[PDB]
Amino acid sequence: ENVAELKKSFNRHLHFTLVKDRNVATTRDYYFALAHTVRDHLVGRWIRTQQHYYDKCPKRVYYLSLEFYMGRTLQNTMINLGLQNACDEAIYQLGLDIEELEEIEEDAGLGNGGLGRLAACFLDSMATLGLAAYGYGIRYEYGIFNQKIRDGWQVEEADDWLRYGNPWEKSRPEFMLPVHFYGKVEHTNTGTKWIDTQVVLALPYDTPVPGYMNNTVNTMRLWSARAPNDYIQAVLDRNLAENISRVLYPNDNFFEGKELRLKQEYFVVAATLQDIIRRFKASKFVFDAFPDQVAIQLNDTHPALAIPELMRIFVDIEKLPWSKAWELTQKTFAYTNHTVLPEALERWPVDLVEKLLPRHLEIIYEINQKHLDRIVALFPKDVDRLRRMSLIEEEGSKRINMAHLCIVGSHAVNGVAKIHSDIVKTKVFKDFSELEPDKFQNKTNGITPRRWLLLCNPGLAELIAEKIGEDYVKDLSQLTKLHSFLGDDVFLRELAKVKQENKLKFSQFLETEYKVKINPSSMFDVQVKRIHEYKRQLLNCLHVITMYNRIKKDPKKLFVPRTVIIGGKAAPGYHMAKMIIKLITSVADVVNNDPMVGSKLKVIFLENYRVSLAEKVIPATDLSEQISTAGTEASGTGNMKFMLNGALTIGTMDGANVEMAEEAGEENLFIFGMRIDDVAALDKKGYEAKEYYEALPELKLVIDQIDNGFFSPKQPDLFKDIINMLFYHDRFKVFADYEAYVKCQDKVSQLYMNPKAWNTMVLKNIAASGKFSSDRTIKEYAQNIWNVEPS
Template sequence: MAAPLSDGERRKQISVRGIAGLGDVAEVRKSFNRHLHFTLVKDRNVATPRDYFFALAHTVRDHLVGRWIRTQQHYYERDPKRIYYLSLEFYMGRTLQNTMVNLGLQNACDEAIYQLGLDLEELEEIEEDAGLGNGGLGRLAACFLDSMATLGLAAYGYGIRYEFGIFNQKIVDGWQVEEADDWLRYGNPWEKARPEYMLPVHFYGRVEHSPEGVKWVDTQVVLAMPYDTPVPGYKNNTVNTMRLWSAKAPNDFNLQEFNVGDYIEAVLDRNLAENISRVLYPNDNFFEGKELRLKQEYFVVAATLQDIIRRFKSSKFGCQDPVRTSFETFPDKVAIQLNDTHPALSIPELMRILVDVEKVDWDKAWEITKQTCAYTNHTVLPEALERWPVSMFEKLLPRHLEIIYALNQMHLDRVAALYPGDIDRLRRMSVIEEGDCKRINMAHLCVIGSHAVNGVARIHSDIVKNTVFKDFYELDPEKFQNKTNGITPRRWLLLCNPGLADVIAEKIGEDFVTDLSQLKKLLDFIDDETFIRDVAKVKQENKLKFSAYLEEHYKVKINPSSMFDIQVKRIHEYKRQLLNCLHAITLYNRKSDPSKSFVPRTIMIGGKAAPGYHMAKMIIKLITSIGEVVNNDPYVGDKLKVIFLENYRVSLAEKVIPAADLSQQISTAGTEASGTGNMKFMLNGALTIGTMDGANVEMAEEAGEENLFIFGMRVEEVEALDRQGYNAREYYDRIPELRQAIDQISSGFFSPRDPGCFRDVVNMLMHHDRFKVFADYEAYIKCQGQVDQLFMVRAVPSHGEAGGHGHGSAGRSGGSWTERAPSYTRQHCCGVGQGEAGFDMSAAPITAFNPEGCLAGTL
């Protein structure tokens, strides 16, 4: 951990976060002591570091409350169109520092805590991550909430308040072991329970048809208790809401089914209902068809839609009556964005409410539903697409099954009229998949029930149109859009890399914090040696700080002048951590060859494997086993290290990303929908080695392809290889270094105590590799050689702290450092020109909406 600033350094520090006024510091100290006394009931004699964290969190939260209430009052008065972002995952990470940054409080808090004899960084480290997500999908949701608040949009995030988030990963003897993430054990200072808005959610039961309409009766009721978390915009006084639902059993749950003697058993059975919000399913890009998961999906949808309709009806603006009675204007006031298919039940649930409860005509209800809902597709991998058994729906949600059948019939009638006699097309486009086990294709339901469907990077959106939903695209081409993912520059630059943010602000001002296109102004400074040195100095300081962290937590001595070569993301075959492993082995095998240049590297790989994903767990074991051999070879010394970063999560990402020299984004072309880690690394001045996949394509366009290390097959070449037939042995036989690496893995060189340990990995690579690792091996190794050559080029002449290798340079040709400096000046989030987080609000799939109507900053 970095040494705290001296009193003098603290006062002379000028940054984009502003200088703290003495009054602000005094107010923070007073509020801190008040919360320690009255909220935590402690004094300084018995208070623990965790008490100090909670006192500070409550102090900061106090600054949110007034803004939060005024924002919601403002929305009520103005009645803007509201955006409802429905997601089963919100990967929020920590909240304290982000809130201080967005409210401009960080320096005041830092000074106040320092005056109290405490260390702000140490208190920040105490906060638990809110790990309510698996990876990119959940983190995207979190970034969108920050961005929509910063844009002043009337936006709400709706999800589940999981008691246990994504598991904590421990590495024991090289293997992943999962531990429960009891993140709420000590309480959550940011949330506010709202029992007055508790709502019933129904399951099971049966459907009654009568002349008065349709009724869903004899249901089992579970209550949804909302917990609200404030989402502050950046210095604009807007504070939006993330509302997460927690499952509660009603007081009479199961009691009517038992006699008095079974009272204890009945009360214990309340857990059956409350299990719905107990734990996040730890699967990323993989569908697990468990009934509890379907319950979670309906639970969040049913509670949220009741809330949306209550808010729609009660808004007073532009309506003579105190309560809206007509749903004609519903799509003008409500936009529901479905984050993947997990909230797909919003479509039949909205239909059920409109038709059965509100007595809206079926056809009119269908138009309202389609105009209200929009769908974001996150993957084209077949194993990730949700396909629920009809039998499960029949038992759990009988009325929704009827509605889905009716919607599907309308849809197929339309297709049949446009394509008469094309039975195969009807089969391909049906929401109901026939077979031994009839299934509901949730992606098809989302497409027919939404007015807009978007992929999350241009290449992904093209694949969606040309393959996955080709028939649907031919039917309704105007529905299909692209919205390339993005990131919030507050957390992913200002918060995690304040040194770099300060260097940039000194040159171009602070507007880049909310408009990343401003970074183009840095092109004026590519020949400015002072600027280049300052940027290099920040990178080296970040590397030194992270080296100290690794030494403390991993007991491994890191060479901070080595290239920090980093791949952090979920462990999955398509992300090809195995290709990275083969490069590490190849480098290790070259250690004794004097003809091969050996540039010092610290290879770090981090990420969690789904608990039931055998191959992913084997990949982790292989990484740790390679590290065991390499890191203990005295001949290698500090020239090569291979480290597995345990328990990768948002708060660890905030440490590792600013320290990275090389970002690995090496998925097989056509498999990574977008990626957002790639953008975080680029925004923090790392160079990218990657395939032309996902958002790497737009990043290459923005930064100039010459400023990335692009290698490997393109999508068309992958498809051609599929048609031709991929034969891994051809590459194994032809490439000596590849054969040597595979033979070492196979023979037990990296697992001497269990020589057959990696039999399954080798068998998969040789005979069942869907992601064609060997096909890109040669190009990857060659490209990594170009990375080495560039890293050996010195930066501007070393002046003490700014020395080291040219880890910030870009391009692959010769020439001076300054000729290649655009990597630092042009590499930025691919959301440039697309509003916050790459989200183009002018053509957003959440229906057209005028941001100017939100009056950001006028609350």
């Protein structure tokens, strides 16, 4: 606990655990010694917490997800355990730099973006709320790839995060389980049997999840695939079974029907459900009480197979009758929808499923038959309603609509922001909500204020605590008390000072990683998120070039200097996203080297955007770019992180941006562009991109520069694919929000010129960010879906 004992443990681990002394120990050795020193502090409570759940047997919550975008664990653990100050002191006394030790840790990047990071924030919140919750996923050998930029383009490198060892995971060999694939179904007089299957073992690894200052330490269980049991070739072929948990599919909001992805989904699902049933049978609590002891949240449709798998276990194995089994199943599962973009919908062809999971295909067909029998009985004449509500789309080569399977097999279905949940309920699944009104809900996303405030921005956390105490950490709504300081000049300077320090520290980072020199006086304009056409960093890029031309046309004009930062990873096979990245690095090259613009404007493509880098750049941001086309971003969470950390937002009325406006007051955000209904109008009328190109002189110059090679001289036609998409296939109407966006941007610079007014708006944003704590989000899930209670 105290400094002396922490130093003693550190030296002890460096010695016995790392087998080193101070003259031969590497930096990595020191990081590992500290990690083990911190990890030791988790054990007692990890054991008690899990023992407690067995004793008092509260209802358990299982968050089933193919992704857990955890980031680093060291600092997060020290903070939630109240050990950071002591460890900082101990490490300092040992003559070491704790910051350096922390940078040695690899991010556990087992996620693509929002969906995976939401799972991570939820685990922190559920532990902080004292819920008997478990995270269940896959332990990928390789997470989201490390991004490099070569000659302006994205290059992918394997994310070998486990190469040096992960001290934060605990193998649980005694819980290994067999998972089945392929084979065939036999309908015997003893029950249908699934036989001649190939077997792959599932080895679980537990990672502790410390609640914030509360003695609760929950568990995240990730499964790894292992082979069971010419000789050499046979041994090498063991790689095939093990490839199942080998790599995270690098796609964000995009469906790719590869068989290996289907294997991963069944793998997690099968291992997870069996483990859950086994723990249920040992609870010394037949399966009638199951739904009162178990809640399983389906994170998107990725784990949809859990439904037919639970049915398979209840029926084929436990011999329960179908009706009883189906009843228990619905009461067990709840489904969370995370998107409305067509390219992201999971639709598995029945042939692939038939080959890999013959018995699940049969169970799904059965589910679908009973389902449609009901509709036929309710709307005998609506024949097309049946076609629309079926789990099977015969529309060409038959496929399974996984979202529909999740809806019929779940008692609750929720979206992740009001605007989104509404669209899901009344438009996308109108036929279903009409039948079961009460089944559809909304649960607006949230972020954990531990990692995204206390951890990433200690200066702000301290300043806030200075003024209003520490209650806000566990009750973020407490930030409204900050309103008492609206006219407090001294406080406003203190707030600005914290942002300035964060910017200074991040600028140091930028100068050492990039050739560029940073004007620390500039406004940090930031857009960090996965590269997507719908998120439109392309629009941001149009505005950047626009500011460039303005400086060239009139260099002596008064101008608020900016440092424009854009970062994010493109899915490997997403060609347009890769072109967009190259467009940004090209533009940056011209801008950063034009002697006429100089320190007026700097552009940086932030490489390898991931959780640990987000913790650095967000606290250093002044302007947060949240410009997705109205109706495309289901919720967003980066928007919330920026709001909590003192940045103002420039964005569309989309996803949770709408709620950030409700809480803070629309005028305290720079809202702009078409709204959901305006986008529909343009669609109805038909979008003619050329018209804006024609009518907007600044837009036309930008476009022409791009298309003629102004930014790619050595290859004039390089950006032709973008031009063509922009003029003839822009599903996201980049040109249609261009004018309002730029006008809006000008207004931002205006406000920035007035520090007191700017920080006054910042204060209103921070003071109103309380609704976005994931602790609030989780309370709502616990109360209205899982029916469990905080402790």
